[PDB]
Write a protein that binds this DNA or RNA. Sequence first.
DNA 1: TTGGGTGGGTGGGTGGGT
Length: 191
Amino acid sequence: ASFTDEEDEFILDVVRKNPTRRTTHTLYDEISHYVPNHTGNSIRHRFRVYLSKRLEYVYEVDKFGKLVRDDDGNLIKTKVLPPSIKRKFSADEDYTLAIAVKKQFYRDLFQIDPDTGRSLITDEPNFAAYRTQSRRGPIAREFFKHFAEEHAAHTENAWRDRFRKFLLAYGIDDYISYYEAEKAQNRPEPM
DNA sequence: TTGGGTGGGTGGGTGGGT
Ligand SMILES: [K+]
Ligand SMILES: [K+]
Ligand SMILES: [K+]
Ligand SMILES: [K+]
Ligand SMILES: [K+]
Ligand code: NA
Ligand code: NA
Ligand code: NA
Ligand code: NA
Ligand code: NA
Ligand code: NA
Ligand code: NA
Ligand code: NA
Ligand code: NA
Ligand code: NA
Ligand code: NA
């Protein structure tokens, strides 16, 4: 659906009051709760392609991102954007995403559960010695929605682009082997 | 190995890249 002048100014006012959370997914999810028929990603695109063009200014915040006020308790306008504070991805989080995506490729390919070897109900090779190769595969939206429920540190959205932008570029097999090698008397760094 | 920003944001972000 479309955005009214009201929805547009509200989205702008919230981003100006939250400078450090402008590149997150969560801020737009929080905004969407107050905007009828719009998802968080719908609000995020609306800001990235249109509203960010006329941000004009943001409000002043401290090192923690909380709003700073004058001696009258009024907000202070500014044109200096503060650092985009975003939750980072650990090598462990990156691994679990590589393992989980390999497990889903396996299921979809061999119709055998990777964990037990049991057969699956649909509409043999070793998992460890299985290679996803160049497969980007078909992944349902439900995979990331369920994967965020298990790993709520990052949102389903955030997990989705970690796989498309980093995981698929670094290589699933490539990162799994890398993570394991460093695990033996070493510590692995995230993509 | 099937997109770009001179197509445009009143087309929309579950269509996808950026
Ligand atoms: K393309
Ligand atoms: K189009
Ligand atoms: K388009
Ligand atoms: K577009
Ligand atoms: K880019
Ligand atoms: Na829209
Ligand atoms: Na987005
Ligand atoms: Na966009
Ligand atoms: Na865009
Ligand atoms: Na074009
Ligand atoms: Na264009
Ligand atoms: Na244009
Ligand atoms: Na248009
Ligand atoms: Na539009
Ligand atoms: Na596309
Ligand atoms: Na997209």
